[PDB]
Amino acid sequence: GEELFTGVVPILVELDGDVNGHKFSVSGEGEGDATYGKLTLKFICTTGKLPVPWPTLVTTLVQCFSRYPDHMKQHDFFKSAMPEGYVQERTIFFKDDGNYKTRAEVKFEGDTLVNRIELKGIDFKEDGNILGHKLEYNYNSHNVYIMADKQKNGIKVNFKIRHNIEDGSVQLADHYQQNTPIGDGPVLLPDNHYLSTQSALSKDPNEKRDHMVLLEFVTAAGI
């Protein structure tokens, strides 16, 4: 799996979502360079105005691009599952608000790494921080904890994202995640470790569509 990530790989992201009845689609394109744990992508809401804040979608919209230090390479489940890919499922609970449930398949289609996602959000408050668009357009650094799930030949991952709200407070989004390989081939099951992430969101001055440009760095640590 590792050999497929030694250079710059193009990425395509396609998401179909329904949050409280509001249906939307997002498409993104960019490139990933796992040697530096770097991702540069531009996402566009192809159905009009996004009904939820863009920051709430970052974690859903390719951890195989994380940089794993040489001494930890035998712990990189993500790249070990390629090119056949892996299924990535999550429930994301927004504190004092609704939850997203997501199911995604991440795999290569030719030499393009593709992330195809289905997202369903329910129980959001119409006046809450999410449907009421009260989140700032920025993003914090977080640690993402990984454990092997030997029973399913996959991994379980959990972390908490802190979204800044415009009145200065914080909206917590607890993430529970499971990844399992698509192939029947072997994968690497890791010892407990974590990924350190940092993300910068920006806008394209020439773009009129509802969009988000994202620059992210992720490196594995803990061993």
PDB file of C-alpha atoms in Angstrom:
ATOM      1  CA  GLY A   1       0.000   0.000   0.000  1.00  0.00           C
ATOM      2  CA  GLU A   2       2.828   2.412   0.924  1.00  0.00           C
ATOM      3  CA  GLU A   3       4.250   2.536  -2.651  1.00  0.00           C
ATOM      4  CA  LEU A   4       1.080   4.251  -3.919  1.00  0.00           C
ATOM      5  CA  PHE A   5       1.707   7.264  -1.661  1.00  0.00           C
ATOM      6  CA  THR A   6       5.323   8.173  -2.394  1.00  0.00           C
ATOM      7  CA  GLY A   7       4.343  10.969  -4.782  1.00  0.00           C
ATOM      8  CA  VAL A   8       1.603  13.634  -5.107  1.00  0.00           C
ATOM      9  CA  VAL A   9      -1.779  11.887  -5.516  1.00  0.00           C
ATOM     10  CA  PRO A  10      -4.882  13.572  -6.948  1.00  0.00           C
ATOM     11  CA  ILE A  11      -7.988  13.424  -4.761  1.00  0.00           C
ATOM     12  CA  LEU A  12     -11.738  13.532  -5.663  1.00  0.00           C
ATOM     13  CA  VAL A  13     -14.375  13.879  -2.929  1.00  0.00           C
ATOM     14  CA  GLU A  14     -18.129  13.427  -3.566  1.00  0.00           C
ATOM     15  CA  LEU A  15     -20.626  13.864  -0.669  1.00  0.00           C
ATOM     16  CA  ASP A  16     -24.471  13.551  -0.675  1.00  0.00           C
ATOM     17  CA  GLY A  17     -26.111  14.781   2.493  1.00  0.00           C
ATOM     18  CA  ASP A  18     -29.490  15.304   4.122  1.00  0.00           C
ATOM     19  CA  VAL A  19     -29.580  17.259   7.344  1.00  0.00           C
ATOM     20  CA  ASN A  20     -33.095  17.707   8.878  1.00  0.00           C
ATOM     21  CA  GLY A  21     -34.649  17.363   5.445  1.00  0.00           C
ATOM     22  CA  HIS A  22     -32.220  19.765   3.788  1.00  0.00           C
ATOM     23  CA  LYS A  23     -30.602  17.877   0.875  1.00  0.00           C
ATOM     24  CA  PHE A  24     -27.228  18.992  -0.523  1.00  0.00           C
ATOM     25  CA  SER A  25     -24.167  17.726  -2.463  1.00  0.00           C
ATOM     26  CA  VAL A  26     -20.532  18.695  -2.215  1.00  0.00           C
ATOM     27  CA  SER A  27     -17.782  17.937  -4.655  1.00  0.00           C
ATOM     28  CA  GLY A  28     -14.072  18.533  -3.961  1.00  0.00           C
ATOM     29  CA  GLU A  29     -10.771  18.216  -5.816  1.00  0.00           C
ATOM     30  CA  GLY A  30      -7.177  18.592  -4.802  1.00  0.00           C
ATOM     31  CA  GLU A  31      -4.018  16.677  -4.066  1.00  0.00           C
ATOM     32  CA  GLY A  32      -2.394  14.857  -1.171  1.00  0.00           C
ATOM     33  CA  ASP A  33       1.320  14.359  -0.387  1.00  0.00           C
ATOM     34  CA  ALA A  34       1.693  11.751   2.415  1.00  0.00           C
ATOM     35  CA  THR A  35       5.491  12.289   2.498  1.00  0.00           C
ATOM     36  CA  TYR A  36       4.691  15.677   4.223  1.00  0.00           C
ATOM     37  CA  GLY A  37       1.259  14.688   5.557  1.00  0.00           C
ATOM     38  CA  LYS A  38      -0.147  17.515   3.437  1.00  0.00           C
ATOM     39  CA  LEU A  39      -3.595  17.959   1.826  1.00  0.00           C
ATOM     40  CA  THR A  40      -4.712  20.911  -0.368  1.00  0.00           C
ATOM     41  CA  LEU A  41      -8.373  20.753  -1.504  1.00  0.00           C
ATOM     42  CA  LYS A  42     -11.175  22.991  -2.746  1.00  0.00           C
ATOM     43  CA  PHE A  43     -14.798  21.969  -2.069  1.00  0.00           C
ATOM     44  CA  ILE A  44     -17.886  23.418  -3.721  1.00  0.00           C
ATOM     45  CA  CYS A  45     -21.578  23.010  -2.789  1.00  0.00           C
ATOM     46  CA  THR A  46     -22.970  21.931  -6.127  1.00  0.00           C
ATOM     47  CA  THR A  47     -26.628  22.297  -5.071  1.00  0.00           C
ATOM     48  CA  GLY A  48     -26.636  25.967  -4.042  1.00  0.00           C
ATOM     49  CA  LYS A  49     -26.075  27.327  -0.484  1.00  0.00           C
ATOM     50  CA  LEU A  50     -24.707  24.777   2.001  1.00  0.00           C
ATOM     51  CA  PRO A  51     -27.300  24.355   4.752  1.00  0.00           C
ATOM     52  CA  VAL A  52     -24.827  23.680   7.488  1.00  0.00           C
ATOM     53  CA  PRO A  53     -21.577  25.436   8.311  1.00  0.00           C
ATOM     54  CA  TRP A  54     -18.567  24.301   6.276  1.00  0.00           C
ATOM     55  CA  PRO A  55     -16.434  23.639   9.384  1.00  0.00           C
ATOM     56  CA  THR A  56     -18.873  21.000  10.512  1.00  0.00           C
ATOM     57  CA  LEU A  57     -18.016  18.988   7.335  1.00  0.00           C
ATOM     58  CA  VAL A  58     -14.154  19.012   7.436  1.00  0.00           C
ATOM     59  CA  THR A  59     -13.762  15.724   9.315  1.00  0.00           C
ATOM     60  CA  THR A  60     -16.150  13.947   6.951  1.00  0.00           C
ATOM     61  CA  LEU A  61     -14.700  15.387   3.764  1.00  0.00           C
ATOM     62  CA  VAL A  62      -8.742  10.714   3.749  1.00  0.00           C
ATOM     63  CA  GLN A  63      -6.449   9.733   6.600  1.00  0.00           C
ATOM     64  CA  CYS A  64      -4.307   7.570   4.255  1.00  0.00           C
ATOM     65  CA  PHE A  65      -2.541  10.974   3.553  1.00  0.00           C
ATOM     66  CA  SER A  66      -1.197  11.182   7.124  1.00  0.00           C
ATOM     67  CA  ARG A  67       2.554  11.190   7.471  1.00  0.00           C
ATOM     68  CA  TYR A  68       3.676   8.152   9.491  1.00  0.00           C
ATOM     69  CA  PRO A  69       7.298   8.461  10.760  1.00  0.00           C
ATOM     70  CA  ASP A  70       9.583   5.700   9.508  1.00  0.00           C
ATOM     71  CA  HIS A  71       9.687   3.957  12.954  1.00  0.00           C
ATOM     72  CA  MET A  72       5.899   3.754  12.998  1.00  0.00           C
ATOM     73  CA  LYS A  73       5.159   2.593   9.411  1.00  0.00           C
ATOM     74  CA  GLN A  74       3.982  -0.880  10.495  1.00  0.00           C
ATOM     75  CA  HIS A  75       1.103   0.897  12.299  1.00  0.00           C
ATOM     76  CA  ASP A  76      -0.396   2.590   9.188  1.00  0.00           C
ATOM     77  CA  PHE A  77      -3.629   0.718   8.620  1.00  0.00           C
ATOM     78  CA  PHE A  78      -4.893   3.308   6.156  1.00  0.00           C
ATOM     79  CA  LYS A  79      -2.338   2.907   3.415  1.00  0.00           C
ATOM     80  CA  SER A  80      -2.141  -0.883   4.080  1.00  0.00           C
ATOM     81  CA  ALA A  81      -5.775  -1.263   2.870  1.00  0.00           C
ATOM     82  CA  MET A  82      -5.080   0.309  -0.572  1.00  0.00           C
ATOM     83  CA  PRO A  83      -5.760   0.220  -3.459  1.00  0.00           C
ATOM     84  CA  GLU A  84      -8.935  -1.777  -2.709  1.00  0.00           C
ATOM     85  CA  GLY A  85      -9.713   0.716  -0.001  1.00  0.00           C
ATOM     86  CA  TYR A  86     -11.608   0.907   3.272  1.00  0.00           C
ATOM     87  CA  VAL A  87     -15.051   1.763   4.593  1.00  0.00           C
ATOM     88  CA  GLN A  88     -15.121   4.640   7.038  1.00  0.00           C
ATOM     89  CA  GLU A  89     -18.199   5.080   9.189  1.00  0.00           C
ATOM     90  CA  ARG A  90     -18.869   7.673  11.901  1.00  0.00           C
ATOM     91  CA  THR A  91     -21.530   9.021  14.294  1.00  0.00           C
ATOM     92  CA  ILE A  92     -20.710  12.626  15.220  1.00  0.00           C
ATOM     93  CA  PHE A  93     -22.648  13.934  18.181  1.00  0.00           C
ATOM     94  CA  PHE A  94     -22.948  17.705  18.423  1.00  0.00           C
ATOM     95  CA  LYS A  95     -23.236  18.576  22.111  1.00  0.00           C
ATOM     96  CA  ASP A  96     -26.721  19.884  22.977  1.00  0.00           C
ATOM     97  CA  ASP A  97     -27.740  19.495  19.326  1.00  0.00           C
ATOM     98  CA  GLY A  98     -28.155  16.876  16.544  1.00  0.00           C
ATOM     99  CA  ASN A  99     -25.877  14.143  15.126  1.00  0.00           C
ATOM    100  CA  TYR A 100     -24.429  13.204  11.759  1.00  0.00           C
ATOM    101  CA  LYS A 101     -24.073   9.580  10.738  1.00  0.00           C
ATOM    102  CA  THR A 102     -21.713   9.093   7.780  1.00  0.00           C
ATOM    103  CA  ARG A 103     -20.643   6.117   5.641  1.00  0.00           C
ATOM    104  CA  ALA A 104     -17.780   6.569   3.094  1.00  0.00           C
ATOM    105  CA  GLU A 105     -15.718   4.363   0.804  1.00  0.00           C
ATOM    106  CA  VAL A 106     -12.131   5.552   0.253  1.00  0.00           C
ATOM    107  CA  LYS A 107     -10.240   3.834  -2.554  1.00  0.00           C
ATOM    108  CA  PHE A 108      -8.317   4.336  -5.740  1.00  0.00           C
ATOM    109  CA  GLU A 109     -10.118   4.706  -9.084  1.00  0.00           C
ATOM    110  CA  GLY A 110      -7.218   4.514 -11.480  1.00  0.00           C
ATOM    111  CA  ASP A 111      -4.581   6.798 -10.007  1.00  0.00           C
ATOM    112  CA  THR A 112      -7.087   9.078  -8.269  1.00  0.00           C
ATOM    113  CA  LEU A 113      -7.807   8.583  -4.530  1.00  0.00           C
ATOM    114  CA  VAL A 114     -11.594   8.891  -4.164  1.00  0.00           C
ATOM    115  CA  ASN A 115     -13.673   9.535  -0.994  1.00  0.00           C
ATOM    116  CA  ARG A 116     -17.465   8.908  -1.716  1.00  0.00           C
ATOM    117  CA  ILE A 117     -19.620   9.829   1.289  1.00  0.00           C
ATOM    118  CA  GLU A 118     -23.277   9.577   2.292  1.00  0.00           C
ATOM    119  CA  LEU A 119     -24.218  11.830   5.277  1.00  0.00           C
ATOM    120  CA  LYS A 120     -27.481  11.900   7.237  1.00  0.00           C
ATOM    121  CA  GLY A 121     -28.040  14.490  10.003  1.00  0.00           C
ATOM    122  CA  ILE A 122     -31.038  14.394  12.384  1.00  0.00           C
ATOM    123  CA  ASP A 123     -32.348  16.116  15.491  1.00  0.00           C
ATOM    124  CA  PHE A 124     -30.690  19.452  14.846  1.00  0.00           C
ATOM    125  CA  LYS A 125     -32.253  22.527  16.548  1.00  0.00           C
ATOM    126  CA  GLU A 126     -33.389  25.088  13.926  1.00  0.00           C
ATOM    127  CA  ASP A 127     -32.079  27.817  16.218  1.00  0.00           C
ATOM    128  CA  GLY A 128     -28.904  25.980  17.256  1.00  0.00           C
ATOM    129  CA  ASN A 129     -25.284  26.712  16.407  1.00  0.00           C
ATOM    130  CA  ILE A 130     -25.381  24.477  13.325  1.00  0.00           C
ATOM    131  CA  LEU A 131     -28.645  25.240  11.521  1.00  0.00           C
ATOM    132  CA  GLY A 132     -28.379  28.812  12.778  1.00  0.00           C
ATOM    133  CA  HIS A 133     -24.881  29.264  11.303  1.00  0.00           C
ATOM    134  CA  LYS A 134     -23.185  30.523  14.451  1.00  0.00           C
ATOM    135  CA  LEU A 135     -19.803  28.832  13.905  1.00  0.00           C
ATOM    136  CA  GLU A 136     -16.732  30.853  12.967  1.00  0.00           C
ATOM    137  CA  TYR A 137     -14.957  29.986   9.738  1.00  0.00           C
ATOM    138  CA  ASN A 138     -11.724  28.654  11.281  1.00  0.00           C
ATOM    139  CA  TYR A 139     -10.515  25.371  12.683  1.00  0.00           C
ATOM    140  CA  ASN A 140      -8.490  24.095  15.646  1.00  0.00           C
ATOM    141  CA  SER A 141      -5.689  21.475  15.901  1.00  0.00           C
ATOM    142  CA  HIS A 142      -6.814  18.110  17.360  1.00  0.00           C
ATOM    143  CA  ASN A 143      -5.438  14.696  18.335  1.00  0.00           C
ATOM    144  CA  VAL A 144      -7.196  11.673  16.777  1.00  0.00           C
ATOM    145  CA  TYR A 145      -6.833   8.463  18.804  1.00  0.00           C
ATOM    146  CA  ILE A 146      -6.586   5.098  16.986  1.00  0.00           C
ATOM    147  CA  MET A 147      -6.905   1.524  18.428  1.00  0.00           C
ATOM    148  CA  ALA A 148      -6.999  -1.702  16.551  1.00  0.00           C
ATOM    149  CA  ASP A 149     -10.308  -3.596  16.409  1.00  0.00           C
ATOM    150  CA  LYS A 150      -8.852  -7.106  15.917  1.00  0.00           C
ATOM    151  CA  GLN A 151     -12.289  -8.649  15.799  1.00  0.00           C
ATOM    152  CA  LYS A 152     -13.261  -6.815  12.602  1.00  0.00           C
ATOM    153  CA  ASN A 153      -9.793  -6.661  11.092  1.00  0.00           C
ATOM    154  CA  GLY A 154     -10.153  -2.843  11.357  1.00  0.00           C
ATOM    155  CA  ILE A 155      -9.607   0.119  13.667  1.00  0.00           C
ATOM    156  CA  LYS A 156     -11.771   2.151  16.016  1.00  0.00           C
ATOM    157  CA  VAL A 157     -10.993   5.852  16.276  1.00  0.00           C
ATOM    158  CA  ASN A 158     -12.337   8.509  18.621  1.00  0.00           C
ATOM    159  CA  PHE A 159     -11.750  12.219  19.143  1.00  0.00           C
ATOM    160  CA  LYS A 160     -13.494  15.439  20.038  1.00  0.00           C
ATOM    161  CA  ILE A 161     -13.529  18.438  17.646  1.00  0.00           C
ATOM    162  CA  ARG A 162     -13.958  21.881  19.284  1.00  0.00           C
ATOM    163  CA  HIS A 163     -15.760  24.345  16.927  1.00  0.00           C
ATOM    164  CA  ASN A 164     -15.412  28.055  17.859  1.00  0.00           C
ATOM    165  CA  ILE A 165     -18.808  29.830  18.058  1.00  0.00           C
ATOM    166  CA  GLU A 166     -18.981  33.531  17.099  1.00  0.00           C
ATOM    167  CA  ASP A 167     -19.882  34.628  20.746  1.00  0.00           C
ATOM    168  CA  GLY A 168     -16.509  33.173  21.889  1.00  0.00           C
ATOM    169  CA  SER A 169     -17.822  29.888  23.272  1.00  0.00           C
ATOM    170  CA  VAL A 170     -17.133  26.328  21.960  1.00  0.00           C
ATOM    171  CA  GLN A 171     -19.432  23.755  20.229  1.00  0.00           C
ATOM    172  CA  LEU A 172     -18.147  20.171  20.960  1.00  0.00           C
ATOM    173  CA  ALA A 173     -18.541  17.442  18.272  1.00  0.00           C
ATOM    174  CA  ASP A 174     -17.732  13.958  19.695  1.00  0.00           C
ATOM    175  CA  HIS A 175     -16.621  11.609  16.905  1.00  0.00           C
ATOM    176  CA  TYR A 176     -16.927   7.754  17.096  1.00  0.00           C
ATOM    177  CA  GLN A 177     -15.373   6.118  13.991  1.00  0.00           C
ATOM    178  CA  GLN A 178     -14.815   2.577  12.576  1.00  0.00           C
ATOM    179  CA  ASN A 179     -12.795   1.638   9.502  1.00  0.00           C
ATOM    180  CA  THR A 180     -12.808  -1.794   7.884  1.00  0.00           C
ATOM    181  CA  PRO A 181     -11.098  -2.930   4.722  1.00  0.00           C
ATOM    182  CA  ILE A 182     -13.082  -3.427   1.466  1.00  0.00           C
ATOM    183  CA  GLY A 183     -10.764  -6.191   0.223  1.00  0.00           C
ATOM    184  CA  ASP A 184     -10.297  -9.643   1.779  1.00  0.00           C
ATOM    185  CA  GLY A 185      -6.544  -8.899   1.604  1.00  0.00           C
ATOM    186  CA  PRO A 186      -4.367  -8.411   4.654  1.00  0.00           C
ATOM    187  CA  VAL A 187      -4.054  -5.117   6.506  1.00  0.00           C
ATOM    188  CA  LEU A 188      -1.768  -3.784   9.297  1.00  0.00           C
ATOM    189  CA  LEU A 189      -3.440  -3.670  12.727  1.00  0.00           C
ATOM    190  CA  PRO A 190      -1.855  -0.904  14.840  1.00  0.00           C
ATOM    191  CA  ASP A 191      -0.741  -0.440  18.379  1.00  0.00           C
ATOM    192  CA  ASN A 192      -2.510   2.520  20.054  1.00  0.00           C
ATOM    193  CA  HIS A 193      -1.327   5.835  18.665  1.00  0.00           C
ATOM    194  CA  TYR A 194      -2.736   9.173  17.497  1.00  0.00           C
ATOM    195  CA  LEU A 195      -2.685  11.606  14.556  1.00  0.00           C
ATOM    196  CA  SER A 196      -1.943  15.291  15.265  1.00  0.00           C
ATOM    197  CA  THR A 197      -3.952  17.465  12.878  1.00  0.00           C
ATOM    198  CA  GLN A 198      -3.906  21.093  11.890  1.00  0.00           C
ATOM    199  CA  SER A 199      -6.232  22.678   9.299  1.00  0.00           C
ATOM    200  CA  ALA A 200      -6.475  26.223   7.745  1.00  0.00           C
ATOM    201  CA  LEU A 201      -9.717  27.169   5.924  1.00  0.00           C
ATOM    202  CA  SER A 202      -9.773  29.975   3.391  1.00  0.00           C
ATOM    203  CA  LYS A 203     -11.812  31.268   0.431  1.00  0.00           C
ATOM    204  CA  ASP A 204     -11.050  31.672  -3.291  1.00  0.00           C
ATOM    205  CA  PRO A 205     -11.543  35.388  -4.051  1.00  0.00           C
ATOM    206  CA  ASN A 206     -12.737  34.589  -7.578  1.00  0.00           C
ATOM    207  CA  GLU A 207     -15.240  31.951  -6.669  1.00  0.00           C
ATOM    208  CA  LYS A 208     -18.951  32.758  -6.530  1.00  0.00           C
ATOM    209  CA  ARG A 209     -20.188  29.328  -5.540  1.00  0.00           C
ATOM    210  CA  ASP A 210     -20.542  28.401  -1.810  1.00  0.00           C
ATOM    211  CA  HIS A 211     -17.088  26.806  -1.169  1.00  0.00           C
ATOM    212  CA  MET A 212     -14.224  26.116   1.185  1.00  0.00           C
ATOM    213  CA  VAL A 213     -10.445  25.859   0.437  1.00  0.00           C
ATOM    214  CA  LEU A 214      -8.610  23.713   2.899  1.00  0.00           C
ATOM    215  CA  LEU A 215      -4.934  23.202   3.758  1.00  0.00           C
ATOM    216  CA  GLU A 216      -4.246  20.445   6.312  1.00  0.00           C
ATOM    217  CA  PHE A 217      -1.184  18.751   7.845  1.00  0.00           C
ATOM    218  CA  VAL A 218      -1.477  15.454   9.700  1.00  0.00           C
ATOM    219  CA  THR A 219       1.334  13.411  11.264  1.00  0.00           C
ATOM    220  CA  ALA A 220       1.184  10.202  13.348  1.00  0.00           C
ATOM    221  CA  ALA A 221       2.710  10.184  16.836  1.00  0.00           C
ATOM    222  CA  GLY A 222       2.525   8.331  20.146  1.00  0.00           C
ATOM    223  CA  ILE A 223       5.152   5.620  19.585  1.00  0.00           C
TER     224      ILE A 223
END
